[PDB]
Design a protein around this ligand. Sequence first.
Ligand code: SF4
Ligand code: SF4
Ligand code: SF4
Ligand code: SF4
Ligand code: FES
Ligand code: FES
Lengths: 633, 633
Amino acid sequence: QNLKSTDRAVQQMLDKAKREGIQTVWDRYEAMKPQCGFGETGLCCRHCLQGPCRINPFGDEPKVGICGATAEVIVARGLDRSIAAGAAGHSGHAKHLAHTLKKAVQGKAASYMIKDRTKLHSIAKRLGIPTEGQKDEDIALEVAKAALADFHEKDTPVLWVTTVLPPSRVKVLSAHGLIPAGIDHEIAEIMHRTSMGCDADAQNLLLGGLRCSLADLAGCYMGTDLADILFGTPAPVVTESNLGVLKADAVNVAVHGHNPVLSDIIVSVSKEMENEARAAGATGINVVGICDTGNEVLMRHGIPACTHSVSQEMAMITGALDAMILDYQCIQPSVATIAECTGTTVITTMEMSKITGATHVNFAEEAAVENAKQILRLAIDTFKRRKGKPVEIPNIKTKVVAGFSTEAIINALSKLNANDPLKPLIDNVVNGNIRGVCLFAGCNNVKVPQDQNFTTIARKLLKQNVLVVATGCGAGALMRHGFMDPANVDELCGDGLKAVLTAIGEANGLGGPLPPVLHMGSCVDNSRAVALVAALANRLGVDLDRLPVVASAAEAMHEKAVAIGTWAVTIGLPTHIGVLPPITGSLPVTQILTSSVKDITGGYFIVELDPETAADKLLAAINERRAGLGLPW
Amino acid sequence: QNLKSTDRAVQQMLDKAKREGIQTVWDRYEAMKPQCGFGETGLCCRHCLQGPCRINPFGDEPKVGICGATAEVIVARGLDRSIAAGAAGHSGHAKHLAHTLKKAVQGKAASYMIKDRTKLHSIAKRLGIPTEGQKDEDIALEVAKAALADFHEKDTPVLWVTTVLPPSRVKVLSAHGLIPAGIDHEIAEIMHRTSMGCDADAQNLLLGGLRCSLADLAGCYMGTDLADILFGTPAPVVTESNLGVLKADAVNVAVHGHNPVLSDIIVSVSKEMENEARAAGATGINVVGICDTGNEVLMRHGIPACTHSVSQEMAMITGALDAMILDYQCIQPSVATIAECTGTTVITTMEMSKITGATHVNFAEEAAVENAKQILRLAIDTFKRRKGKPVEIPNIKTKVVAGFSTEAIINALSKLNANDPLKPLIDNVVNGNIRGVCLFAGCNNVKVPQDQNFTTIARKLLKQNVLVVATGCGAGALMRHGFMDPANVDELCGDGLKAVLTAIGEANGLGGPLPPVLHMGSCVDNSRAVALVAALANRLGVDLDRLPVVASAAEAMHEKAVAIGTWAVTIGLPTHIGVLPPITGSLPVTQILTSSVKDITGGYFIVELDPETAADKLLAAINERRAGLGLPW
Ligand code: SF4
Ligand code: SF4
Ligand code: SF4
Ligand code: SF4
Ligand code: FES
Ligand code: FES
């Protein structure tokens, strides 16, 4: 089982699933091997009904698509569509929060409100919305309207790109025609240009892809901004992770998916219904997180994280998961089938994200609290049905310190320098105590033993004094293996990094260091890392492609992860991906994405499936940036 | 060669290509066989990097996607993305015309103007834009702004859906949640809901697809509306089609793609540069059409149609094609390679549609006439380079009567009844002289001997007194085989249909009948057929699903054709498709699309690859509608 997952709680549940004859994601993977090499290399096209077309990576015919589409066109078009689909997911998330804020401040959804006025005003100021002498609800209405306006063409470009990056970077991107005109506009234009008989030049196609990836960045940043207004900007928090946070005697309710509009209300209402759960025989309601909705409520409320990503079915296999409340994205639809075996009540809530065999509850912002109670009562009913059923919850959990929004990091740093809080970080980059910064992002992937790349790479970087930040299931992987427990600083961190984490931690009244890895939140909260990196660039007077900052999507899976990787490259970062994207069938496209794009944006992809090799390559990328600044390394 | 194309001019050029060693679309098809059956059935998914996933149509594992996606989810998600891509192509076309009109009336593009004020005012009235006492340029500005507004969410739904269908049909669609909220909004929501871990219920997925297909309908109707304002509403016209319209002694310039913003200016400017072409040794400039841009200038200017779709390379093989001026969509990228062999100058003009090895000319509305001259001079230069080269132009062409916009058809009918012009058509439906109406639409497809399904099906329907209208490459197929020549009415038409075409033709001062098939224009001009059918419904007091009207995408290829077929079903029409769409891997999805959707929208797909069988099925569908109205059949 350790070839499937390095998580020991997951290994225990894989044995239980095998005993009980419950098919898992890993079983369905094994049943799929060997996978189609045309698809794995990207040399397959189904963009019209003359297909499917494929191209042999090597050898004889077929060499070209039926319409004349070359390998480099086919690969570029497929990649572009994956970027657009990722952008659409982050677009939809942000759009649904923008409508939630608009409803809140127009008096249409009283369960929602402006919880962070400070953030609201700073966003309004960044966008040029006047605040002085205005009511909050009117400022927020203007912010929500500006968010919705970024989805379409208007007299300005996408402001959640142009107002969040340094002017020098916007200038570079503008010179190459890469600034998005509208978020959904770019998604549609990708789908158009990649349809049959349209764009057929790899470089032109890929520039469109870079531009659409910035539409994805805008959706991420908009999503974080609006979620923080509505639900609070995260601050440091301490909780736990892994399956051991389930409690046999409680109603265990997992929030799963991505959008907190739903999950954040569940958290509040669950506290109300504690007595009603005790009436049913439970100790209370135990809300736990799966995937990124779980990260959202972990970051804001300290809700413990149950599991992530590839191992999500394992929470159910314990027998103790009474409900799984879903919104959208990264939900294995197998959960609806597995629930028949495990007793779990799987509940969908979004009109455009239903699963055959799952109970659907039509959530509406206008009735959020009512819907939450309907949902939690189904969960209580399910708990009662397992009175006296044995469960097997692995007694495995880790301590997780998290909540490191960029505002939190700046505040923590300000304890070392009150009016120049970035300077202490830059000082230690310059003197070598911090070699650089690495953002771990993205998913787990059944092709990679779960968490293996994240932890292998992270260990090597931390020993080399790299400051490591993480989001999404990269944060999930690191938290479930102790990387967010400050007790592990001595073991994991080089001396210089330990010194820095210790100084900051002690200066914030903690008696101990910051954790080895800083949890910056969900996948949309990769935007928080952008905010931090752009602020560092501005403080140093350079563009992002001169900073010793890298990213690693070490076990990427979702189209969203491809979009995030592509905009990391586009804003100037060396960007590792630890799974093969479907590009290796075209050497010209691979060359553009791993080399020549350097001369456009300064970033570049690092495709490397061996994690020890990937870490050496990330260190070389960091150290090249150090040398470019004239620093020792 | 007659197994590849039933067009004798195409057969002649296939022999020339074979002699000269020039690879064609049919050669690349043969090199691709046998094609992947997982893709052909729709049982392949590449929506995340855990894939590719495939499902055996029958037999043993794999039975399910790695994430748990069933066959019916995989098939529905792939179909939805094809609909969204089609919508994006028609979206982009309409959007680029909306920007062209806005620029024209804001004084920014003087080569463009309001050519049809009548149409402008009728559109403004349909949309509720006030006209009385307003300047045309201000009315048009409001129309252009309303067009752009339909791409995003606002306080109204998509008006180019809700104002173009009868209220009863809008009510049916609204009750099922199928009215689009915004064109690019729906495209993005499709890409979101079909991404990994989101929508996983076939019925829910397919309802999203129906809704996105209405976004496509809106793009089509908007495109026709704006093109008519800018370039004139078509009226009856007589010209010719097939390769014989090329002239060895002229500068032969093909306009190819879809958007007339470009091609319509080429047509005007080409007339200016006649003397400049004679200076170079030519008789003049001979503009000819390929694909739908060719239909646009055929319908409005009588520009002869050279070829269509699958056979586009053959125009080049003659050796006489001096230039091919491209915008976007349905352009085989092979043309850029073939030009090295044939001497043709292939010119791209749109930023998002480039082809490696083709000359790019950055067309801008603001400089349209300048760009046109730059482009036509490259063509003249190319003509000079083939002084004394032998060419082989097949001496094959047909006479084409076309220009049957819905306004034209109504006007023609008004010669038989001035204040009730639809009544004479309905009278002859009722008395049986017209059995019903069939719209042929869509592409050719290399899998089907070119034109074979269109002509086989059309012959059977015409003998059964069906009124046949056609658009796109369905019109192209029928025109190249004589179906738009009134000389062929006696041979092709049943007695009742002949009587009706003759009465209308003679009453319009023609001495002869209308042609056997009425050419209603380009693929976006399928919207014209909707206008006609909706007017018939309104005049009869019934919804479209009670009318004896059917559609046939008899040789479908492009994602746009899938979108058109799906919205034909959604507005209530029995809709034949003569190529296999990638649905047969899921019986539940096939059952929904060919049967149970009847109970939602009243329309349904008819999947039938045998054209004689398809014609019998279309006749049965028509006759069922007749019986439902209590008519004999
Ligand atoms: S777009 Fe070209 S390569 Fe793709 S399926 Fe169609 S013919 Fe084949
Ligand atoms: S990291 Fe990937 S699997 Fe995890 S929640 Fe984000 S997109 Fe989904
Ligand atoms: S979305 Fe599911 S079925 Fe599709 S490639 Fe990913 S794991 Fe396979
Ligand atoms: S009918 Fe098809 S091939 Fe022809 S121009 Fe329209 S979408 Fe293209
Ligand atoms: S041939 Fe396998 S992914 Fe298309
Ligand atoms: S396995 Fe051939 S289309 Fe994917």
